[PDB]
Amino acid sequence: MEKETGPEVDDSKVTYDTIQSKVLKAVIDQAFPRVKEYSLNGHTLPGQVQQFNQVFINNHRITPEVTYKKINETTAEYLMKLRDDAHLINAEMTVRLQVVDNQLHFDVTKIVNHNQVTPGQKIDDESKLLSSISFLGNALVSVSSDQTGAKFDGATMSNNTHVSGDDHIDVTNPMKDLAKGYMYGFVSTDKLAAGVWSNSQNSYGGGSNDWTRLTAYKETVGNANYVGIHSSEWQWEKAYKGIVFPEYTKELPSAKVVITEDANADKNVDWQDGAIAYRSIMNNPQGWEKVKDITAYRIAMNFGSQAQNPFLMTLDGIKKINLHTDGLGQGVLLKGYGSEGHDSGHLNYADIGKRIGGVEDFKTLIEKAKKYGAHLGIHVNASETYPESKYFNEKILRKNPDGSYSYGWNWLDQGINIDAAYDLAHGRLARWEDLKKKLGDGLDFIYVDVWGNGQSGDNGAWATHVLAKEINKQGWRFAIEWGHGGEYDSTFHHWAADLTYGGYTNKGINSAITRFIRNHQKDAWVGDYRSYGGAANYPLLGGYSMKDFEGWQGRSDYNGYVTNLFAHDVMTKYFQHFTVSKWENGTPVTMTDNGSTYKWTPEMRVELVDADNNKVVVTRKSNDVNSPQYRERTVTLNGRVIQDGSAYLTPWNWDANGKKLSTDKEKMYYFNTQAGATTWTLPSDWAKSKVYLYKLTDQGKTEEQELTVKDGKITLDLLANQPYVLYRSKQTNPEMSWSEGMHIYDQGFNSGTLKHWTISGDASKAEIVKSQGANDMLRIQGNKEKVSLTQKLTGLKPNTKYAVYVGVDNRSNAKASITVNTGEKEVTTYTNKSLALNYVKAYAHNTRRNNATVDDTSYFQNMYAFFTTGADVSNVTLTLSREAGDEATYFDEIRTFENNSSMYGDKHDTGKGTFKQDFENVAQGIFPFVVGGVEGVEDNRTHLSEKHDPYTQRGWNGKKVDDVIEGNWSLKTNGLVSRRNLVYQTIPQNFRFEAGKTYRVTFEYEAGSDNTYAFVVGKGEFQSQASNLEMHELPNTWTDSKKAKKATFLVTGAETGDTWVGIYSTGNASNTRGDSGGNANFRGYNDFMMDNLQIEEITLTGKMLT
Ligand SMILES: CO[C@H]1O[C@H](CO)[C@H](O)[C@H](O[C@@H]2O[C@H](CO)[C@H](O)[C@H](O)[C@H]2O)[C@H]1NC(C)=O
Ligand SMILES: [Ca+2]
Ligand SMILES: [Ca+2]
């Protein structure tokens, strides 16, 4: 390439003025809001040196008619009239340029469209809107190739761990052309650096073209190349299908430049100085301050009406983590907080799940969690919904160009995508306001699932900013799924934080510039995940690594959750308590993974600082990618080593909520992923102190040991992958008030003692033991006489109907019972040997080997008693008992909660009399059935269906069968045809078919096809050596009937007491009648619904006999 030239500048017709602070002077054109040049400390940066007196309005070139006024020494104002009759533009905008110390602010302060436009109303011609405003062509700041050290550095979005989003371009003549959008951009010489911010929600496309709030352009002027940074175009009045969006979607255009000399004392001026200064002018995502102290993120899941994780139970998990981490902050995302659980009832944000304890228990969880620094978030959806939802309506549904529905996912029900732009234009905001009104204060974050993938149409930068603003306005922090989503407003990205998702092309933001700037504000980055290579091969700043133990994707591994917190997240979070000040790359390395061999340039040293001038230095131990030392770092704090390789001894000076700890609560955490002694220099304020070590377990601080300090050092030779904490004085563990609000003390056996139970019988026969998943349970075994454990149920309401269950897995033939005595009445329920394995994936005691009870299986099922308090609730007792037996019964999770069922002879209480289940008042699950093994351990596709006429019922979009047969609820199975396996069954603890007695079992049912489902009678444990079943295939209910059919069966209890009934998925193919795909799923060909179950003990007489 040859030396380039362009027109020189003739400014003979130009009148310049100057505005200035004490440190920065800007020469500005009186004809147009353009900065020609900046001066600071005798150094200069050009702005837009060549006049370009045009703007683009709705993509039309306009020469504005401009009048000017200098307002004061720092501020000038421009009135800019905009007219283009041919394109229906008739408007004016006011712009101010203002110097604020070393910042220049560009603000459009007023916009007037002379066309009639009313936000929220129809507009007959959208071209009359003033929808976009572009000052592209006027650089806010630039640098010339004639200046020493001229360079541009910019970040674009990359989520591919192999590919940096950053460009580092020397500004030379000649140089390659440049006309490119950026998220962040800096120009610098060897004397000054500048960074540019804009609130522009411009996009030039997806991927690296998105979030492009800036545009950088090379312009050749005389014999110099300039690279200038421009704001990208701004948005203003917009509409969808002629309906103008609400006023709150309009945000006045704004941009800022900041100009700095050396800002990290390294005696070089470069983009890093610009990035430090940029923090003073940038947007900050709402809630960002909380991020650095949320060390323990995880999901607690509910699904399919099961109430796996009631709100008050999550509080016990929080207390376990509070003990085990010694008071680190937590963030629990409630996936399934609403409706029947996860992926039920979407869009109705205010519909807080009733079966997990409703708004009352959610409020209690939020309030009581505060003292543990545990913040709650909820999972919502703004992209797809189901017929059951209050907000399912034809008008909101997304349709394809051919008029067909844009179907969403099918699981419990068939979802349909919604049109997000329509939704915004028709009251979406009010749904968030309803939730805020119902729930009140204190919720931390909203995680909006899916958004960004285009299911609901446009989910780009502008639309996301609007959505985030709705959420932030209620006082909530924004979180989203994708590495590329919500770059402007998000504080958490699930595909960045869970390193296992999506593979190497789908992770966090792979940009050193962006991470430099914002590391401390969000979990949006590339974390350590060696098999993705590139940036993921041991990032020096770490990066959030999320695991779970409360049911999400069947995750139950509590111990692995805790070790991962300490292996990745403690140091990640430590660094977020500082801001990055310096970033040094090493030499390129060659890596091979994921089908490619590629070059990668790694960070070798990162420095961070805080407002107290603490200095952290993080150094990679080798640049050699094939050395073990490439995946090791040292960390120093003011020169003192706090991490080296597999071990750290890190100070922690913040409580669970991030507040500064008092001196006597200052601590250090030790963790080593390897065996071996390590030696550490103590800081001066520890070196002459006594020092005590504690091993951290789910019981808190244990195994107190005073350490020997020698020469101001300590040596630690402790268990690998085990957290410890150190203090300068003896510490104790506080009272946890286990299970507060749940009417019983320590419902999950987490407190390490049984002393709060009154034990009758031989107490040595009752112990707390760990499941195969380390879940503590009550075990009773080897007892020759009855053993009982009793507590009062406390805090109950008088004259109130309740349910109580305990999870029970009984390996003994002995009677294992739950008994409630209200003071006035006693009710009892029991099980002999358990016969149904647990197949609920989000439930902690399902039968997956790694959270099995014992012998690699779990038969846990909830065992209920139903009772009513009288006038006095001072002496209501709950007793767990086990009659004599050699083998073990396991109990866990005692849940007492209001319930208004009337299942026993039309009365609430456990008692005799005809059994009826109308499904209208189910405590949880599908009682008296439990889910069977048809799908193995799964988020079972059987749940309680909720009525929403007409959408859930026959006829809507050709639906063949009703979701709900009578009342508001039925028992629905979705699409489980041709599986040759058991869908669900009664178990004797739920309904016992007494030995030698005969019962009439009646129910109403819908079935979409003939003989796809069968009513079955079995006994004992079902085996798919396959068990004998009495088989009654059921015909479809719609080809020859306008409603559910009634079925009736006689069943005599086997002498072994273990008879049950259920619904079985046959081997027969279903019939979708020529329909396919979404229509076939929606219309219910493959579905089965039950309602109005009745089981009546009878004596066979007359024609019953035949
Ligand atoms: C194409 O299947 C994948 O994506 C769908 C959504 O379009 C599902 O998320 C699916 O995961 C499955 O989700 C259901 C609940 O909807 C259930 O939780 C299953 O355990 C889970 O496999 C996902 N992957 C698949 C089917 O492998
Ligand atoms: Ca510097
Ligand atoms: Ca437990």
Ligand SMILES: [Ca+2]
């Ligand atoms: Ca019903």
Ligand SMILES: [Mn+2]
């Ligand atoms: Mn449903």
